[PDB]
Each structure stands twice: as C-alpha cells, then as structure tokens.
Amino acid sequence: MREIVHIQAGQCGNQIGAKFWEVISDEHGIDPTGSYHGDSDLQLERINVYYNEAAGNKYVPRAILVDLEPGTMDSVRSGPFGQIFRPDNFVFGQSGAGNNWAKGHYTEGAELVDSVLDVVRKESESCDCLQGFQLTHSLGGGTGSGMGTLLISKIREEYPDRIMNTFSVVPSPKVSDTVVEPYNATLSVHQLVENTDETYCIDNEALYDICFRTLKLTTPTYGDLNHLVSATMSGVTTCLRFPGQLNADLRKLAVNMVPFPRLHFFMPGFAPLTSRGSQQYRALTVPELTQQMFDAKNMMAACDPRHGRYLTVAAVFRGRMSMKEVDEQMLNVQNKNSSYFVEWIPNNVKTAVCDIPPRGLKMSATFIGNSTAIQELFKRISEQFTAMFRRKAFLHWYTGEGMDEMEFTEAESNMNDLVSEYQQYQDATA
C-alpha cells in the first residue's frame, strides 16, 4: 500500500521525530521492543505505511536519521525506543554545520549526501507503493537547513512524481536563537520554494505562547513542544492509516490546498487544547473544535491571520462525529467571517473525517490554513536579511565555503518576488 519515508535531519529533526515516533508507536500499539502488543485490528491494518515488518512480530519504523555530529544521534539511540529503530539508518557525519548553511550544503552535506541517498534508495526500493517523503527539520539550524535543501533537491530529481512534504521550524518574530539564522532561512527558502510540494511553518515562540496561555504550563520543554508538533503530524496523516467517513491522503491535501505552485506554505493548528484542571468544565463538541481551530491565539505560526485573507482551508477531524454538524459549522465560519477569505475562491474549506480519535480524546481536529498573512514572516525575513547584508554581516563565513555574492542576491530577489506574489493575490480583482 501507500508508504511514507520519514527523513529526520537536524536537531529539530531528531528531537521532533523521536517524539513523533513515540506517539506513532503508541497509536499502533508498538512497544519499545518493536513487537506488536496492541488491542485492535486497525493498528495492523495499515501498519506498513510507516513500518517494515521483519519476521518475528517485530516492526521497524521506516525512518532515516541524518545529522552532521553524532551527539544528537547518540542521545536518540540511548533514549526510549532506541532498539526498535534498525541501526542501519543512523547516518551521521563528524564536523557539524556550525549553523552555517553554506557549509552544510556545499561541504559536509556534499560529503554525506551519497550515503544518505543510498539509504533513501534502499528504503524506497523495499516499499510496495511509495506515496511521499516527509522531512522534519529547522530553518535556522545550519545542519537542518543545508542538509534538507540538498536532500530535497536530490530526491526531487530522483522521484519527480512523489509528494515532498516538509515540517520546518521557522524564525521567531522576537527571539532569534541563531546569529546567522536570517541568511540560513533565506537560502533555505530559495530552494524550498522550488523543490518542495508543501511546507508547514512551526514557530517555537507561538508554541510557547500556547503553552503558557492555553495549557497553563509553567515549565514547558522542547519535548512538550515536540509533543504538540507530533500530535499535529499524526493528525495530518490519520487518513493514510485508519478508515473513516471521509478520507484524504497527502496528494489530495496538496491538490486542494495549493492554488498556485509557489504559494504552498501553510499554517498548522490543533484542537482541542485545554489545561488539566479546565478539562472538567468544557464539553467536546464540533462547534468547540471549530472555534478553537479558527482562533488567532491557537495558530502555531508566527502571524495573526486576521491581517490577511485565506486561500484554502483544510480541517481534518478525528473521532465519531456528525458530518451535518461539521458542515454547518464550516458554513457558519465562512458566512460570519467572509471578509477573511479571497473572493476568487468559492468554497474555501476542505474537510475530512477519520473515525479513530487520538489517545484519550473523544474528538479532535487538525487545522491547515493557507493565508496571505504569512507574507509578514517572509517580509520580516527579507528586511532583516537586507539590513544584515548591506554591512556584509558574517558574510565571510559563507564566502569561505564557496558562495559568492550572486547567490545571496538571487536568494533575496526571489524572496522579494515571493512576498510580492503573496501581496498580489490579496487583490479581490472582481
């Protein structure tokens, strides 16, 4: 059947994907030994979409781990779920990227990409029907950014008809964690906009806001943010694994959600989100999930969507629900807030319903929005990048890896053109 090759790259890649595989193994009843010990047939009905079965009731997650320094991989291998992963797919270098995109893309990635692609081909030839590739990585991180751009280019050349999905951690609007993050982000998007099919933008700052505000958490960790991101990832591909009243694979989402080839970035969201104490005072209904999804404070992206308009909206629900209820809620949303949707797209909302709810919830819903408001992210990145580039800030660190001024110039020009395209598609024109 359809199979997904999950590629992990960078620190975000490794950590987020470790939490992701924890969640996925929990959903399918796979204990840390790889042996199936679940309680339902649907867990094994579509176990092959993310797992390879080695005879002996052991299942191996079809994942590839990529990094340039073995520290994060050692931490992953020694932690929980270390022995389920077949050790063939721990492909790492020795130098590290040093947060330099130029380094990770032209020297260290250039040295390691042959082994990584051989592993990719090994995992792809063993598949029954390769559906798409999922990449978890950060943009500010040099390893993540560079290795991901290189791998995406090479794999797009290798399989031009497969789905290339990426979950990227984007720069924060206030608190940056890397000095050279703007250049890495610019040079990364300069290739992501060309080779990827769709990219989900995750900001750590929005996750912190959700954690302190909604969940009432006082000591949130990167692991809990990874838990939220992993819940989103599991909600995205719930139709590839369990039946439902209305299913939607990855290609259906790509078709319904990308109106024009370059405007493929999406803002993910999740519902329901409650603190532990407040769980006893709020009922779980479809209107509740709908109101939590279409809320500015519940957007995991670093932008208030009320500043622009939406082009496409995807809402995948989980758990037993009424389709009439969901459709009426979507009608109410589109009617009451019609000014937030582009006039040239009638029927802005795409829906899907899976019959299997997440662990511990009666019902949930995953939000995916394509809003012109995301132009704020790209405009801020362009402004910061231009201000830094005028003074040649840290430019020698990248020119020493083989880059010239023309590559930065072309990246910045393409970024300005992308921002201008998003601004162009805010005109009603009718």
């Binding site: 201008s420 162009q424 005109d427």
Partner: peptide, 25 residues
Amino acid sequence: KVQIINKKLDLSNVQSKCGSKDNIK
C-alpha cells in the same frame, strides 16, 4: 517584479443546441 495572472474571461455568445424552435413554424 511580478504581476498577478489575471485573464479577461468571457463566454461571449453561446447559442442553444436543442432545436426546441425548429418546428415552431
């Protein structure tokens, strides 16, 4: 340096196909 791809679309002059008036005479 881009411009939205807007086209002037029109179904200018479309005639019917069923000859509902062919035997009106």
